[PDB]
Design a binder for this molecule. Structure first.
Ligand SMILES: [Zn+2]
Lengths: 296, 62, 280, 67
C-alpha cells in the first residue's frame, strides 16, 4: 500500500532534486519550507538548499530573515540554506524576442540555466556543495517546458554564430533531462487544496509532468479543517472531504498527504518545524489537534 | 482495414464526450477525470491514424 | 456610482435574456434561482422562465420539486416556471454548441405554443454553452457563404445575433467566490464573453464570511477581503455584488426568497446577520 | 518596411511586459497583474494581425510579379 505521507521522500538518500509546485493560494511556499526542513532534520549528514523563483520573495517572509542571490544558512539550522532569485532579472542583465518565443521551451530554458549558474557559484566560492536541492517553483507559468525541448529541438535541426549556441543548449538540456527523468534522483511534489479548481489545475499539472517523463508520485492537500473533531467550518469540511474521497480513488499509487489548516500564517523556524512534521507522520485530528491550536 | 479503425475511434471519442457531459464533474470528479484521461488517449490515437492514413496514401503513388 | 447589486437588472423591463454562469463550487445554481425569483417578484406582470442545462438537475434539488423538459410553475410562485433539459438527449433526438443550443430554443417555443417575457439560463458549469453565442456570427457566415452559391445555379438567426449583442435585451451574470482560481477563471470568462460582443456588467461573489461581525473563519475572511479589495479595482464599472456565506445548502422557495433579496439590496453583515442565522 | 519595423517593435514590447509580469506576484498584485494580462493579449492580437499583413502584402507583390 501507499502511505499518505512524504516519509519515503523525506528520508530518501537518492534524491538530488525535489520540485514543489502548485497554483493558487494553495500554500505552496509553506509546503516547500516544510519539505526542506524535514529532510534537513532527518538527514543531518547532508547539506540542503531551498531556492525560490517566486517573485513575491516568500522564503524571507516565511523564515523571518532576509534571503537573496547569496545562499545563507537559515538561522537555527546548520544543514539548510536558502536562495531567493529573480530569473527574469538574471536574463535581462545579460540580454530577437520573436525568434526566441516563437519556439516553446527556449524562453524557460534560458531562465533556468541562470539558476543553475547561481547554484554552482554558491558551491564553488564558499566550497560547500549541496547534496539535494528543493525548488519552490513559480506559482504561474510552465517551468519545466524545457524538458520536451531536445525532442522538438532535434526535430527542427534535421530539417533546417547562431547554430552553435542552439545545439549547445540542446546538449545542456539533455544532460539535465538525464537527471530530471530519473525517479530516484528527481521527483515533483504537487500542492493543492480540496476544491474543484485546485484539483483540476493539479490534474493538468500532473499530466504535463508525465509528458516530460518527470516522476510525480506525491500530492500535498493543504488547508483541511477536520471540523468534526462552528457550523460554517463544519460545512466547508463536508465539501473538502467530498473531494478528498475522490482524490483517493483518482490517484491510488500516489502519496496523497492530508495537511490540517492553521489559522493565521505559519512563520519562523519553530512554527514551521512543528507543522512540517505532519508531512512525515500523517496529522491525526484526534491526537494532533493540540499541536495545531498552540500555533495560534 | 486501417482507415476503418480510425473512423471507429472518432465515434468512440464522440460517444465518450457525450457521456462525460451528462455527468457532474463536481459530484463525479473521480470518474469524470478518468474519462478525461481516456479522451486525451483517444485524441492521441485518432491523430495517429490520420497520420498513418494520409501517409500510406502519399506513399501509394508508387 | 455603480451599485454593488443587481437591482437595475432585477427591475429591468428591457431584458429578454439573462445568462448566469461560473465554474466550480461557486454556487452558480443558487444564484440563478435567486436572480429568477427576484425578477419574478419585482415584476408580477411579466412571466419568467428559468431553464438549466446543468446535467446534475440542480433546479429540482433547489426548489424541492421535480422539473423536466415540460415547463412547470414553481409551487408558490405564479409568475415563475422551470425547465431542466439535457441538450445531449435532445440532440440525438462552434458547430457542436450551436446544434445543442438550437434544441433548447425549440423546447422553449414548444412550451410557449403562455409565452415567456424573459428567460434566465443557468448555463452548464463546464464546456462553453455560448460557443453558439459566437455562432450567429458563425451561422450567419454559413448563410453568407450559402447565398454565395444561389447566384450560380437567415434574418431569422440574424435578429437572434442582434438580440444577443443588444445590452438592453441580453446580459451575462458571472458567479465566482473570492479565491485566486475562481477569480482567474472568472476573468477569462469575461474576456471570452466580450469577444462575442456579449454584455457582461455583473459579478456575484458568493460564500463571503464577514467574520468580524471562530479563529478559522476570521482568517479565511481576511483572505476573501484581500481579493475583494482588488476585484473592486479590477472592474470599477461592473456591478460586483457581495453575497454572504450560508451554512448548509439553501433550498425551497422560502429560504431562497429570503436569501435572494441580498441581490437586490446589498447584504449588510451588521443589520442583516439575523436573516442569515435564521436560515441555519 | 513601415509595417515590419512595427512587428519587431511590438514583439519587443510584448516580451518586456511578460518579463515584468513574471516579476510580480499574481497573488498579492492580482489587480495590476490581470491588467497586464489584458494588455499582453491586446499585443498578441496586434502581433498576429501584423503577421497577417505581411503574408498579405508579400502575396500581393508576388502577384504583381507574376503579372
Ligand atoms: Zn469557522
Amino acid at each position: 500500500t501507499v502511505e499518505p505521507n512524504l516519509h519515503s521522500l523525506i528520508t530518501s538518500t537518492t534524491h538530488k532534486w525535489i520540485f514543489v509546485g502548485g497554483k493558487g493560494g494553495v500554500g505552496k511556499t509553506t509546503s516547500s519550507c516544510s519539505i526542506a526542513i524535514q529532510m534537513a532534520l532527518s538527514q543531518p549528514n547532508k547539506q540542503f538548499l531551498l531556492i525560490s523563483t517566486d517573485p513575491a520573495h516568500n522564503l524571507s517572509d516565511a523564515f523571518g530573515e532576509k534571503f537573496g542571490k547569496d545562499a545563507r544558512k537559515v538561522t537555527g539550522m546548520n544543514n539548510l540554506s536558502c536562495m531567493e532569485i529573480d530569473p527574469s532579472a538574471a536574463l535581462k542583465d545579460m540580454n530577437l524576442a520573436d525568434l526566441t518565443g516563437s519556439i516553446p521551451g527556449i524562453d524557460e530554458a534560458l531562465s533556468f540555466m541562470e539558476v543553475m549558474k547561481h547554484i554552482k557559484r554558491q558551491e564553488q566560492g564558499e566550497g560547500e556543495t549541496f547534496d539535494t536541492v528543493i525548488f519552490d517553483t513559480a506559482p504561474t507559468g510552465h517551468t519545466l517546458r524545457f524538458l520536451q525541448l531536445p525532442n522538438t529541438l532535434s526535430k527542427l535541426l534535421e530539417k533546417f554564430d547562431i547554430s552553435g549556441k542552439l545545439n549547445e543548449l540542446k546538449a545542456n538540456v539533455e544532460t539535465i533531462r538525464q537527471q530530471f527523468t530519473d525517479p530516484d534522483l528527481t521527483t515533483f511534489v504537487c500542492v493543492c487544496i480540496s476544491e474543484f479548481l485546485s484539483l483540476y489545475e493539479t490534474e493538468r499539472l500532473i499530466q504535463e509532468l508525465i509528458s516530460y517523463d518527470m516522476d510525480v508520485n506525491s500530492i500535498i492537500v493543504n488547508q483541511l479543517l477536520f471540523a468534526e473533531n462552528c457550523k460554517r467550518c463544519q460545512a466547508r469540511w463536508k465539501m473538502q472531504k467530498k473531494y478528498l474521497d475522490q482524490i483517493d480513488e483518482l490517484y491510488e499509487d500516489f502519496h496523497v498527504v492530508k495537511m490540517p489548516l492553521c489559522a493565521g500564517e505559519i512563520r519562523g523556524l519553530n512554527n514551521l518545524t512543528k507543522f512540517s512534521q505532519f508531512l512525515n507522520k500523517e496529522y491525526n485530528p484526534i491526537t494532533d489537534g493540540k499541536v495545531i491550536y498552540e500555533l495560534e | 482495414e486501417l482507415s476503418k479503425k480510425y473512423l471507429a475511434k472518432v465515434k468512440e471519442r464522440h460517444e465518450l464526450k457525450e457521456f462525460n457531459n451528462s455527468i457532474s464533474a463536481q459530484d463525479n470528479y473521480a470518474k469524470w477525470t478518468k474519462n478525461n484521461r481516456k479522451l486525451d488517449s483517444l485524441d492521441k490515437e485518432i491523430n495517429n491514424l490520420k497520420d498513418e492514413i494520409q501517409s500510406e496514401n502519399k506513399a501509394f503513388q508508387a
